[model samples]
Every structure is written in C-alpha cells, then in structure tokens.
Target: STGSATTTPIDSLDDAYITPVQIGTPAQTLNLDFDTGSSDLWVFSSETTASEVDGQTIYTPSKSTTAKLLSGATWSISYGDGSSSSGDVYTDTVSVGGLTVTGQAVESAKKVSSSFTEDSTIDGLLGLAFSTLNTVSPTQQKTFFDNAKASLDSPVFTADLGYHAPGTYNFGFIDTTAYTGSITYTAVSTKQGFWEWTSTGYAVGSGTFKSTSIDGIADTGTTLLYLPATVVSAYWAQVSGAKSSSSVGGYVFPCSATLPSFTFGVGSARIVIPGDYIDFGPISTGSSSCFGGIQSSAGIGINIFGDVALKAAFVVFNGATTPTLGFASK
Candidate 1:
C-alpha cells in the first residue's frame, strides 16, 4: 500500500490499519495498525494456528535473527467487537526509517482474524498512543510512542489519510504537517482508561433530538460515530430522498443538495460532522443512502468516535509527556 508514502489498508475496523515498521538490527519488517480505541502493539505470527486467526497479518519473528522470546509470559485480550486473541511475549530490535530502536517491546498474538492473517500490505502495529489501557503485561515497559518518540525525528506520529484509501489508514515520520485550526482536548473522567463522555443530543439538517444526555465511551476502534436510535431516525428524516434501505440497514439518501450538517457536543466542545460524511453510498446493508453521521444501535451504549470524527481534529496521546491526551486541528 505504498505510492508516494507507506500505508496499511484498514477496511474500517478499530482505528484500523497501521504502517509496517522494522525492528532489530538490519530491521525485520512487521505490519501494525494504529488504533486509538486500544493502546498496544500486538501482531499475529506464523506460529499461530489458523483457528486462532481470522485474516490479519502474521509476523514471523523466527526469520529475524535478532528476535528473542520473553521467558514464559502469556497474553490475551477481549475486544468490544466480541473478538479476542491470546499469545506469548517476545523482544526484538525494532526500527523505522533506518532509525533503529533496540530491544523494543512487541507481543505475538497467538491468534487473530482471517483478514489480519492474510493481509500483506504491512505487518505489525507500532502503537503510538498512551498505554494506560494497554493489554500488555509485566507492568513496566516503554510504549510504541515512548520507545520510538525519543528516536523519532519529529516527536510526533503523523497519519496521512487518502480519499479512496481502504478503511482509511496511513503513517508519517512524526508529522511535520500543519493543521487548519488549533486543536483542543476534551476532559475525561477515567473509568477504565477510556476517554468516556456524555452526549447532550444530536442535530442534522434542520432537525434536533431531545437532550437525553446519555453517558458513553468514545472509541477509535469503530469506523463511524454511532448515534442513538432517536438521533439516527431524527437526522435521517431531514435528508432529501432519504429512504430506509434494507441493504444497508439504514436510510439511504441521494447525494444531492447540501445535506444538513450533523452536530454534537463533546463535553463543552462542539463537533460538526461534514456533509460528505453524511452520504455513505453502497458500503451499507441495503445500499441505503445511510446517513453517514449517525446510526442506530440495538442496545449498545458505547459511542465510537472514529476517524471520520477524529479527522476533524489533530489528536496527541501525550504518552511520553503525561498521562493526559492532547488534540490539535488539521
């Protein structure tokens, strides 16, 4: 997935897709996805049985002469998507852009997805975010950002997304790019290391929903910002020629006219979803003109604020500097 720059195709899972970086002296390449929903660097491996994998990239560390196992340690993680993986620990020399970082930490998931197991675009994730919620063990170790930031030329992880990029994933060397406006961070009350928040309500086109003030967690794992049922129905009603399409399981609207903007409040900061995001075409169930901004959840309370929402701002998971998170706009 490289043209002018390197990329990892995500297919819209978690903050799906990460760049492949090298570790160890002489660098053994591994594909990794960048996920804000969870903070960790876990990879599928050749040693993993097919039953444990579901289609994700697998790293063969045995090919890397510099690789070593971490004694007898086991790891397992259960995701919000009802998917989970378990594995053993290992250490290796990791590198990026010829910038070598030795003895870098990595986990070999004993299992993974079929997609993850088959993909060859990139291998292994170089997690460049906070690890407070990391599924890693042994307690003390440097994070992907913590270990690489010092060696990273720019002290930042830059994500360059494309219009047709699969699932939306990219990487840069400590992004030196500028942003559109100042970035800001919304405060969070830590419950489980997630950036949890309360939603006041939602608005689309000219319609608005009752301020139910629901409590939910903001995750980067999901691909879109999931809205409650009331909000989804209310907003869909406002779009022109919008009809419920069983194909997508959501209302489909012809991409015509300036669609009404969908807005939501994150803490005190207001976020307005762009019109383009509101007109998702065929990626839905019944080819519904799925209102891109919001969707109905059966009974799920966790609200995912994915790349569509995150792209509106530049975020920093200040892992090295503090336990806090930071945001800036691009």
Candidate 2:
C-alpha cells in the first residue's frame, strides 16, 4: 500500500526537516527527522535519561501491548556533526501517514548528545537510507523504506522537498502533478549503500554548463550543498567579497553581496538553484557577514547534494529490483 507525509523545518534557516511518526500499538506520535543520509529508526523514549531530554516527545513502549523488548539487542549511531546516541531495541508497530509496518525495530534512546537535548523540535530520526547503514548490534534492522518497498505499488518513493515551504514524502507512488516537465531517470550505485549518483556538470548563474562528472549522495539529513573545491571556488568567485575562512566558518561573504544561481545536470535535465538559496543566512544576529549554503566538499572526501539542491528539484528513490534515482523540474 502507498502512504504520504509532510515536513517542517527545525529552524528558520531550515537546518533540518521533521515529520510526524506514529510508534507502538496505541500510537505515540512524535516529530522525527526524515533522514536519507543515515539508516536507523531511533527515538527519544521513556527509557531516555530525563536530563538528556528537553521538550521533545517521548515514546513509552510499556503502555503499548504490541511492544516486545528485543532482548540483548542494542544500537549506537554517531552523526557527522560529532554527536551520538545509543540505546536498547524493541520491535513494535510503526506507521507514517496511514502506512503501517508491523514488527518494526524501534530504537529507544538511552543516552544522547547535548545537540539532541538542545533541539527539542526533533524527537528522533526515521532513517530512509539503505539498511546496510543500520547501527544495531547482533542484527541490523531494515529501514522503513526497505520493509515498505515490497508492499509498495511500484517500489518507489519520491521526495518533494521545498525551500522554506513544506514538502511531501510519498511512498509506493509518484505524484505526476507534484512536478513539472518529464522526469529524468539515472542509475544509482548502491555499492556503498548510499543513494549516490553522478551529475553531468554545473553552471554558475546563467553561464554556460561545464561538462564535468560530479558524484554525490542525496542527503536530506544535511543542511547545505557541498561540491568539489574547484566548483565551489568558481561559484564563490562570481560573488564579490566572498572568502573561504574556516576560522569564521566554511565560507562567508558580505551580507550585501550579489549571489549567483547554481545549476547541475541530471541526464538532460538542468536544475537551477536560486541565488538567494545559496546565501543560507547571516553569520550571526546583527552580523554583516553571511554563511553560504554551497560549500566545498574537499576535506569531506565526497560531494553531497543536501537540502539546498533537493529543494530545487523533485527526487525519487527507486527501490525496484534494480534501483535508480529520478529527477524532475517543478
């Protein structure tokens, strides 16, 4: 069966996206981050340390009759931001937007980093990445998408992530009306257990498209678009008063600087990211310098097409016998 859900930005800068999820038999609803970068369906629960929880919602499995403790099972996950969480495991009924998955692994957080404690907007994460990335010990759990794929009408899920506006995540079906123009499909290499693919090239502003093969992963969990250093330098060079300074933060520029649009290719489709979308936000309150949404992926080893790029196009995660990624303009 098919299902759907919507998203909410955790902060005004759209740092991360959160969506409501129903866990357990009686169904305790919590707003969770729909992360495509990592795999693990974890939550802040009644078992979590009180001192580690802020104002976030917690799942109380003891109240749910269907909850079964996965004795001897445990999980631990560390994020790119250096924050981490570890907890015990349980199998319970989980649903999102009316789509139900019985006996889904629900990781109950026992310890969490300070970052999670501070951001009360997100209660936990519902990973949509490949199951190989799951962090459970003894047995790795299949992601919601992995388990839901077989029952889906077409074994596909589409992401219609927006800039500042709310977007949708539809499973088992693609909404033709949600996008404009014909979709361009591309092969995705799950070799590394990621939704990774190569783009044709990019153009700065309205400039000519340069023929280059840029490979990266589609990470809804990340906030910015990170590309090769050379490409990033080219985009920043077009903007006056822009500089790469790790001291102040990756890349910063005068708040009044004129920004240029970024364009990337998927087959013959060209997705253009607005100039304003690249200017993320100011360095600080009342500050004159602003941070960039497009930064270099040099030290990171690989490029990442995060929310910045996803917001500009319609993305599809195909989970058929042979997986693929689809892109569309809207």
Candidate 2 runs further than 4 Å off:
none
lDDT of 2 by residue, 28-116 (tens): 99999988889999999999999999999999999999999998999999987689999999999989878889989999999999999
After the best TM-score superposition of candidate 1, give how far the Cα of residue 38 lies from its true spot, in angstroms. Answer: 1.2
**Model 2: worst 10 consecutive residues (lDDT sum):** 7-16
Give the Cα error of residue 3 in candidate 1, in Å.
Answer: 19
* Model 1 lDDT per residue over 172-227, tens place: 23342544555445555456666555666656645554556755554544556676
Candidate 1 regions exceeding 4 Å error are: 1-15, 50-57, 96-101, 118-130, 137-142, 148-177, 197-202, 206-218, 240-259, 266-270, 283-293, 320-329
Task: Tell me model 2's lDDT, rounded to 2 decimals.
Answer: 0.91
Best by TM-score: 2
For every candidate, C-alpha RMSD to the true structure in Å: 5.2, 1.0
> What's the TM for model 2?
0.98
Q: Report RMSD for candidate 2.
A: 1.0
